[PDB]
Structure formats: C-alpha cells, structure tokens
Amino acid sequence: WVTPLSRRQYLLNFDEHGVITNAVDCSSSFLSEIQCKTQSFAPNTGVYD
Amino acid sequence: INSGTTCSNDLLYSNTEISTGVCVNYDLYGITGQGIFKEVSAAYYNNWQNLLYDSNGNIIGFKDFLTNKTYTILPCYSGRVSAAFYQNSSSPALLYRNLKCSYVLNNISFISQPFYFDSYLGCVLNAVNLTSYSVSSCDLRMGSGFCIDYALPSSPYRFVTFEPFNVSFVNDSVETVGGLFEIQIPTNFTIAGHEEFIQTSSPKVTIDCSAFVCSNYAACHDLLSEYGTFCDNINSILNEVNDLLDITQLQVANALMQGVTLSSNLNTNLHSDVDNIDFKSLLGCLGSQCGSSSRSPLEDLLFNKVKLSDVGFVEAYNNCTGGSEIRDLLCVQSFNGIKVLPPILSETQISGYTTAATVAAMFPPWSAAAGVPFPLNVQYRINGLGVTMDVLNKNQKLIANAFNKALLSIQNGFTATPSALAKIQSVVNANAQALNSLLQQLFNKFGAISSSLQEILSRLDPPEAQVQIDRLINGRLTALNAYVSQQLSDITLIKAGASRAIEKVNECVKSQSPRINFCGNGNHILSLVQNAPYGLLFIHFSYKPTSFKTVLVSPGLCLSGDRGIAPKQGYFIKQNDSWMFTGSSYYYPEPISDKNVVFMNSCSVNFTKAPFIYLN
Amino acid sequence: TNFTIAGHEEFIQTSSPKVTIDCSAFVCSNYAACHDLLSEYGTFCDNINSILNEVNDLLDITQLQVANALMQGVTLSSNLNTNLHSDVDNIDFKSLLGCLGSQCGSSSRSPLEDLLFNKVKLSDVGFVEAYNNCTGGSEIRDLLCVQSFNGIKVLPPILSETQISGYTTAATVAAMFPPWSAAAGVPFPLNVQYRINGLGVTMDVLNKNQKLIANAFNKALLSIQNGFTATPSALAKIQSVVNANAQALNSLLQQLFNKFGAISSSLQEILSRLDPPEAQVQIDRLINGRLTALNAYVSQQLSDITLIKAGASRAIEKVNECVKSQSPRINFCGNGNHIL
Amino acid sequence: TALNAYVSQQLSDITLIKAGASRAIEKVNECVKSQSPRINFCGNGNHIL
Numbered sequence A: 001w002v003t004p005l006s007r008r009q010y011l012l013n014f015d016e017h018g019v020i021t022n023a024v025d026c027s028s029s030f031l032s033e034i035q036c037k038t039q040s041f042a043p044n045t046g047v048y049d
Numbered sequence B: 001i002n003s004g005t006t007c008s009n010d011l012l013y014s015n016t017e018i019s020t021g022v023c024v025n026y027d028l029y030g031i032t033g034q035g036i037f038k039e040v041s042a043a044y045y046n047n048w049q050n051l052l053y054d055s056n057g058n059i060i061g062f063k064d065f066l067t068n069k070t071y072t073i074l075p076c077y078s079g080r081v082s083a084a085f086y087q088n089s090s091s092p093a094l095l096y097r098n099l100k101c102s103y104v105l106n107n108i109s110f111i112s113q114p115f116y117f118d119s120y121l122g123c124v125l126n127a128v129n130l131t132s133y134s135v136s137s138c139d140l141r142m143g144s145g146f147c148i149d150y151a152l153p154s155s156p157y158r159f160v161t162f163e164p165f166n167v168s169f170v171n172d173s174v175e176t177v178g179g180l181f182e183i184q185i186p187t188n189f190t191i192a193g194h195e196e197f198i199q200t201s202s203p204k205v206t207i208d209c210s211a212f213v214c215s216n217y218a219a220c221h222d223l224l225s226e227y228g229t230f231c232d233n234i235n236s237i238l239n240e241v242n243d244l245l246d247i248t249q250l251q252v253a254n255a256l257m258q259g260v261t262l263s264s265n266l267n268t269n270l271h272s273d274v275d276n277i278d279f280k281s282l283l284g285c286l287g288s289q290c291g292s293s294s295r296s297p298l299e300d301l302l303f304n305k306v307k308l309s310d311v312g313f314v315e316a317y318n319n320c321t322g323g324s325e326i327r328d329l330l331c332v333q334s335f336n337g338i339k340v341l342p343p344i345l346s347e348t349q350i351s352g353y354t355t356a357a358t359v360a361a362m363f364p365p366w367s368a369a370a371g372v373p374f375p376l377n378v379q380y381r382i383n384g385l386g387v388t389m390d391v392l393n394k395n396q397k398l399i400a401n402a403f404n405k406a407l408l409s410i411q412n413g414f415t416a417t418p419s420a421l422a423k424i425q426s427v428v429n430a431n432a433q434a435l436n437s438l439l440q441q442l443f444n445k446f447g448a449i450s451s452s453l454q455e456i457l458s459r460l461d462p463p464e465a466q467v468q469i470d471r472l473i474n475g476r477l478t479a480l481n482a483y484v485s486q487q488l489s490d491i492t493l494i495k496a497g498a499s500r501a502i503e504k505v506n507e508c509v510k511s512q513s514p515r516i517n518f519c520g521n522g523n524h525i526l527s528l529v530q531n532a533p534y535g536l537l538f539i540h541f542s543y544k545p546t547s548f549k550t551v552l553v554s555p556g557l558c559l560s561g562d563r564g565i566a567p568k569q570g571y572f573i574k575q576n577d578s579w580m581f582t583g584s585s586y587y588y589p590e591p592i593s594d595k596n597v598v599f600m601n602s603c604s605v606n607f608t609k610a611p612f613i614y615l616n
Numbered sequence C: 001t002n003f004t005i006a007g008h009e010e011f012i013q014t015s016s017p018k019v020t021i022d023c024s025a026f027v028c029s030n031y032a033a034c035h036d037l038l039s040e041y042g043t044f045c046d047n048i049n050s051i052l053n054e055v056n057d058l059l060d061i062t063q064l065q066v067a068n069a070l071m072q073g074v075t076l077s078s079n080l081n082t083n084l085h086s087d088v089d090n091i092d093f094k095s096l097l098g099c100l101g102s103q104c105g106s107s108s109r110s111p112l113e114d115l116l117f118n119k120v121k122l123s124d125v126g127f128v129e130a131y132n133n134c135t136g137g138s139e140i141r142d143l144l145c146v147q148s149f150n151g152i153k154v155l156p157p158i159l160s161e162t163q164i165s166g167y168t169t170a171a172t173v174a175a176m177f178p179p180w181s182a183a184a185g186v187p188f189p190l191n192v193q194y195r196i197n198g199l200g201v202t203m204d205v206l207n208k209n210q211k212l213i214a215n216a217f218n219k220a221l222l223s224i225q226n227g228f229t230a231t232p233s234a235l236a237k238i239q240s241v242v243n244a245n246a247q248a249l250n251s252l253l254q255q256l257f258n259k260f261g262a263i264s265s266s267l268q269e270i271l272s273r274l275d276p277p278e279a280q281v282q283i284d285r286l287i288n289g290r291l292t293a294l295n296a297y298v299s300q301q302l303s304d305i306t307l308i309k310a311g312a313s314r315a316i317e318k319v320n321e322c323v324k325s326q327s328p329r330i331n332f333c334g335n336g337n338h339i340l
Numbered sequence D: 001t002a003l004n005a006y007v008s009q010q011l012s013d014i015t016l017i018k019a020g021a022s023r024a025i026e027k028v029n030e031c032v033k034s035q036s037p038r039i040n041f042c043g044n045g046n047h048i049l
C-alpha cells in the first residue's frame, strides 16, 4: 500500500512509557476540530463554535 | 498598479462571459477579487467613467467596454458552524444559523447527511425534531427557548424546548361562588433549610513586572529600561486592587462585629444547646483553652474539599525549595514573578467572628435579637406570617426536631453533591485558568525567531538580539495590560457582590427586617452566617406547609348600623352557622375579637351582611 | 380636600445583545499568508472568545435570575382562560395581559407590549429576520450582513420574548384573581384601600368612593397606553441603547480600513504587489492594530456589563419589593405617595 | 497605548463611583427625608435621626 504525504497538523498522545497510542487529524472532521481546540481526547459537554 | 489599459500578455488567457449568481474570481482589466455579479440597469455611467466606488474605496460596480452592460459586485456567504457535543458521542450535532437546508446541502456542504430539517434558528443536522417535548434543564442551550438533549440508545440527539420555570396549579375557582371565595389554608407545617454562598473576596495576585519580562538577562534589562518605567502603572493597579480587597475584608469583619456583647462565663464546651436545639456544628471555641483551629465542623467539611485556600497556597509555596517533587505549577509561576499573597486577616479570626455572631443570638442578653430569647423570637416571627400563637405554644418539641433535622440535612447534603462548593470550585478553576494562560503567554514568538531569550542571545548579534527582544517585550507588556484590565473588571464585580453580602449580613442575620422576599422566599423565619472559602455561607430557615384543605372565606363583613369590619392577615370562615376568624397560614378557628379585626364606619357594597355578630 | 390618581412609567435595562467575534474571520478573511503570521499570536485568539463567552454566561445567569424573580411563589388556578376573565372591580386589565391557559399559541404578548415592540426594529427577532434576509436573495447591502461576513454577529438570548411575556402575564394575574399569591392573600380593592389608608386617609372616604378610584385607574392606564405616540423617556432609552450598540459595531467594522502606517489597508493589494519577505511586515502592521482594536472593544464590553448587571439587580429588587409585595420603604418605589 | 490604558482605568473606576453614588442616593432617600423601619442601615443599631 502507498499513500501520499503532506504538511498538516496532528495531535499526539504519549503514555507513561513514551509510546504513541492515539492520534487525530485536525482537518478530518468536526469532532477532530473540537479535540484539537481542547487539546484532549474526551472534551466536556458544551457548545463549540 | 492593477488598474488601467497597459497590461502584460505574458500569461495570456481567453476572454470569458460574465456569469451572475455564483461567487467566482474575476480579473476585470486589472481588478482582482471575489464576489457575485448581477445584471442591472444603470444610466449614471458617463463616457469617461467605468467604475463605481463607495466611501471606503471598494468596487461595487463596473461597465464592460466590449458589451455596454452594468453589473454589481457583492461578496458571498462567510460564517461559522455551531456544534453541540456531549460527553461520549460518535459525532456532534450541527446547526447552520439563519441558513436553509437546501442552500447548505447545495452550496457549502458536499456530504449526504441523512437527517436534516428546518428550524427557527436554521438548518439542524444530526438531530431529531421533538419540539413537542419540554425539559427543565439542559446543558446544550441553543437559544430562543430551544436546547439539544442527548438520549442513549437514528440519532441520539433531540431538538426539544426549554422551560426552566413554571407555576403551580390548583383546582379552585376564579369567581365568587355564592358570595364567598374558595382558597386553601394549610393544616400542617414543618421547618426547612437552604444554604447560599456569596463570594466576598478574591485571591490577591502580585506580578513582578521585572521578572515576568527579562527574567535574569542583563541586555534584556538594559533594553527594558529604555521604555521608561512601564511597570509602575501595573504595580499601582495591583496595589489598589489589594487595598480594595483589604477594605472589603475589614468592612465584612466590622459588619460581623458591630454592636455585639457577650458574657465572661462561657466556655463553648458545656453551653452549646438551648431549647433542645443542637448548635455544636455551628460553633467554634470561645473561652480559655483552645487550639490554633477554631473552625466549626461544617467549616471543616467545607474546607477539607478545597485545596487552594488561604493555607493551601502557603503550603504549596513552602513545598517548592528542596523537597521531593517540585513538578507543581505554582512553584513554576512563583519562579517567574506570579505569586499569591495571603489576606490581612486569617481564616481563624473570621471563624471566631462568625462564632461570636452566632452566640450573640443564642444566650443572654441576646444582642443579635434586640433582647428577645431564641424560642420567643422564633414564635414571634412565625406568628408574623399568619399563624396563631396557640399552635406554636403547643408545638415546640416538633419545631426543635424540625430544626435539628434541617441542620442534619444541610450538613449531610455537602457530601455527595453540594451546591455552595460549585461556585467556590468555579472561582478556583477560573483563577487557575487565568494564571495558566498568563504563564503560557511566555511561549509565543510574536514574530520573532524563537520564544526563548537564551537562543537569541547565543545565536544573533547584539543589534539583532535587540530587534528580536523588542517584539517579545511589547507582546508581554500588552499581555500584562490585558491581565490588569481583566483584574479590574473582576474586582468591580467582587465589590458589587460584597456590598450585597454585607447588606444581607446586616439585615438578615443580626436583625429581623420587615423586608419581604429579601432574605428568604416570602416565608423566611431566621438566617444564620457561616465562614466559607472566599465568601460566607448563609443558612436560611423557612416556613413550609405540608397539608392543605379547601375552605370558603370572606374578604370583609358589614355589621348592623352601617358599620364594617375587616380582618388583618386572615379571613372569615363559616362553621356551624357562625362567623369566626382564622389565620392566613394555618387553619385554626378562633372567636372574633378586637385585636385581629380592623374597625370601620362604612358598610361596603359587596360585604356579607350578618346582624348576628355581638362585637362592640 | 380632593384627590385623584396619577400614573408614571419607568424603564430599567436588564440585558444587552450578545456579540460574538472571531479573531481569524476578522483579521485574515480568506488568506493563508495572513494565517501563517496569525498562528504566531496563538494566545491572542483564545482570549477574546473566552471573554465573550464569560459575558454571554453572565447575561444568561442574569436573565435566569430575572425569570426566577418573576416566577417565584405564584399559585394560579386551572380554570382561568385569560379571555373570559379580564376585568375585576370595574378595572380593566386587557392592555396588561397576554395569553395564559390551555388555549394559546405562539402569540402570547399584550397589546401594550405589541405597541412597544412595533417601534423597535433592532431586537432579537429583528436580528434573526436580518440574518435571514442576508445573502441568498433580498439584497444584503445593509451593514448587518457586511458585519456578519467579517465575524461580527449577534446571537439570540436563551429565553425568547414570548416566555418573558408569559412570565409577566402570570405575575400580573397572580395579584388579580384568587388566590392572591402576589398580594399576601388580600384582594385588589382591599389592598388599594389599605395602601391609601397607610398615607393618612380615613376609611370612610375610601369605602364611599370606589367607582371614582376605578375610573381613575382606568384613565391612568389609558393615558399610559395612548402616550407612546410621542417620544417618552422609556422609548428614548430603548432606542439609545440599540443606537449605541450599532455605533460601536460600525466603529469596530471601520477599523478594517486603517493603514496603521502600512502601504494599504487591504491584504489583497499587499499580496499581489509585494513579495512575502516584504509583505510579512505589512501584514503584521495590520494584525497588531486589529488585535488592539478587538482588545479595546472587549474591554469596553466588560466595563459595560457591570453597569448592566447593576441595573438588572436594581430591577430585580424593585420587582421583589414593589410588585409582588408591599414594602414599608418610603421614597423607594414611588414619589412618597406610592400605592402599587 | 498609554492613553488607552488611562481611559480604560477611568472607565473602570467610573463604575465604582456610580455604585457609591447610588448607595448615597439610597441613604439620602431612606435616612434623611424619611424614617425607615430598618436596623443597622442608617447608623449603628440605635439610630435616631
């Protein structure tokens, strides 16, 4: 399998051992936009603009 | 530039017709932009005129040379999207305010959404139209009385209405049924409690204007010395905010300690109950032997759930040098100039003042009750609401048990889900967020090559270093100005709240005011005061009926001889063919006398005539 | 020797339009070379939104407190239709009641409220209608849609005007029909007689003269109703607040046409005439000025919200002490001889 | 920048000035021209005139 690359923003999550476990692309969906705005993976309930 | 006839045909293109109704990029003889065209009929274009401008210098029209037609230029839509997301959900709901679903699905969206419908606010995506159902509280408020609710298993989101308040309904009449009205009078009652928190202070924040900017570098200090003082304006604002906080605390202490006198024979270890009412959970220590802590058990339970208190900051700052782990953010903030100072008065002194104010309304000479004993004052304040004195004199142990149960309930309610602690933790989190933002402000480039002065001083020349440090200095000074403006805006509201706090302390606790619907909710009886983190806690006792009955009452009667009688805080009932009097808050028939009836000298029109009342 | 009854009016501001501003949409409309520089001022964007959200939350809490004060301890019967019962003791209340019961619909305001709202266009419903008549037909050359195209937009409040009108109607009915939950259980004529007697008037004249009092109340209500044809003080303030809001919005919008010492106030000409190494400075020159303007605007808003909240608290106190009860505070509700 | 800071400080202080003036108006209307049935408002407990 081959896929192209580009310069884009990504969110990284490091555990207590320094291993990447989760990641989300901020330019994929609106939930990913909310996650990158809150810099987390389980944002609180609210109305995000 | 970009206007005229002399053009460069290096990048040549073919001429295209002018399209109307779509937002496209146009190159009209050098005029470049983006907008929508519209064919109109304009006759103001002369021979030497081909463009239409406004007062701001924007093209809003033109006339083509090849085809003498007129058009208007208007930009297309540009807005944002409002999304409501729950705690754990797959995808959040969408709402395009003031836009139809057709326009969204045809112009700004290219995803085939299965759920879509129009509303009063706009097109709603990923939701169900259930406006026929109403709720009392919802965390996703959209406006105009609509809010989105989440239901765990179509789509889990629902579009319902919002109605947080409603009135109580009865099955009585709204007319005069046979000359008498139909109203309900309570037959049984109890005592209920209610807590309330009012913020009276805020953490005193002090910022070192010479440490936040130019921490330890000498060239940075020499460059900052060229901007004048630029730090005295911040220091004066911080000092005046601290002075306002100190004046507020002193005024609160004076209001708590205004005109109070006790006896020199109390010990708080043997005299802690009156009329079988337990008050041990609302008293500290007053006597000879007592430790460094004088907080009541309620204050202890309140302070044990908050970490950032008057002593918490002191302990956190003590645990910065040496120790085991210095990973706390408070030490990092203190190492940059941001530090919190303790208030002028300790919490133990406020707790002692509150204990003295509470005792002043519990033992002779009853300073906080104008010289009236506690049970007598309670009976008077209950009678003032329309309750006969007989049922109060007969039911005293019941009132004591109700007070004890209310105290136990208000003490146990703070364990699982309190209400006063929410405001305290919200204030703490707001202060922490402000401090974290002010700290993270130092990690911005502000147009420079880096946000660290060490790299700039170890990589570039002194002139380049100055050029790169100037922008950082300006940005940090702007941030400090914004922060002190925010601090002023917050201290104004803190003063506004402390004013009402002092007013309620003076008019609801240490005295009984005739102001109805001010301390409680119309049936207020007694209010107490307790010490709380960054404020005070009030315990409001009220009169709460439990049972009711339907009776027929009369507004007023007229006796023989064109005389009239009018009741005060009561009504006239009829039993066994006899007119009597009853209270407005308790059903207890009693003979008609002169101490509860207003005498008149005129017979009204709609008053019931009864020449059988033998009253002088 | 002889007396009459006079009426007065007073307007107290309790809320304000909720203005939301986006840093990106205001600074860099649709340009990437501008976003690349705005990304450096990261912390300057997520502070204006936070301040505006705090202001909106404070306004919502204020509106909820006003609603709670208007709907605190109101017991009404279930046999009131608001159309069969509209007058008591020869005193009309048609111009002061809306619609209450299981027979109403969307329209629930009163004729007086309708007459007052028919002269004010820049209301929440007005903003909604304007944003609907924006782009997509009904040519949007107005300034509101132009402000909306740059990030400046006004959001509607949490509670609509219909719910507030219903709350006021319920509060008015609470002191008009039994049980009198807003008059301590005293009927309206007896309450008026007691309030007049409390000033030093004997009960004989009050008991003998009741139709005169009813006619005086009706005449006062009619004079208050047919008095908005001219320009009163209440309507003057209701227009002045929205005029000041519009002036502030236009002054904020006009800031986009300033050069701040650059070659031009438009990023298109800078990006189409100069190279990026020479255009970055020109873009930052405008970014700084626009950020300063937004900071000044949010500072002014945070300064005004305090006075707004103070006025709202004063209105809540007047509602709790002068409307739903009779407080023995002289020179507080009226000019000494206040009745109700 | 200095002028903006000064006018911001003035606009901030105006609110406290207006609050104090409103309190003064209330105290004048409820303690000088009339005897209010309130305690610990005009004076200190035993207030006469």
Ligand SMILES: *[C@@H]1O[C@H](CO)[C@@H](O)[C@H](O)[C@H]1NC(C)=O
Pocket: B021, B022, B023, B036, B076, B106, B107
């Ligand atoms: C939106 O789409 C419709 C249909 O595709 C089209 O007729 C209309 O011109 C579009 N609007 C704009 C502003 O491009």
Ligand SMILES: *[C@@H]1O[C@H](CO)[C@@H](O)[C@H](O)[C@H]1NC(C)=O
Pocket: B065, B066, B067, B068
């Ligand atoms: C447009 O007007 C000019 C001025 O009279 C004229 O010379 C030209 O022929 C006109 N163009 C067309 C297409 O009629």
Ligand SMILES: *[C@@H]1O[C@H](CO)[C@@H](O)[C@H](O)[C@H]1NC(C)=O
Pocket: B117, B118, B119, B129, B130, B131, B132
């Ligand atoms: C949503 O439901 C309400 C109540 O049934 C109805 O009046 C309204 O027309 C519905 N909306 C749409 C877009 O069908």
Ligand SMILES: *[C@@H]1O[C@H](CO)[C@@H](O)[C@H](O)[C@H]1NC(C)=O
Pocket: B188, B189, B546
């Ligand atoms: C009134 O309520 C109390 C509380 O439960 C109860 O103990 C008492 O028996 C009741 N009295 C009557 C007459 O129902």
Ligand SMILES: *[C@@H]1O[C@H](CO)[C@@H](O)[C@H](O)[C@H]1NC(C)=O
Pocket: B274, B275, B276
């Ligand atoms: C008076 O009240 C106290 C406190 O409730 C009680 O202990 C005492 O027994 C009462 N006196 C009499 C004679 O009942």
Ligand SMILES: *[C@@H]1O[C@H](CO)[C@@H](O)[C@H](O)[C@H]1NC(C)=O
Pocket: C002, C003
């Ligand atoms: C008081 O004035 C009214 C209005 O003119 C009049 O109807 C009434 O008779 C007057 N009362 C007396 C006692 O003159």
Ligand SMILES: *[C@@H]1O[C@H](CO)[C@@H](O)[C@H](O)[C@H]1NC(C)=O
Pocket: B605, B606, C088, C089, C090, C189
């Ligand atoms: C007295 O009753 C009549 C009907 O019999 C009614 O029209 C009038 O309004 C009533 N007046 C008062 C003061 O209740």
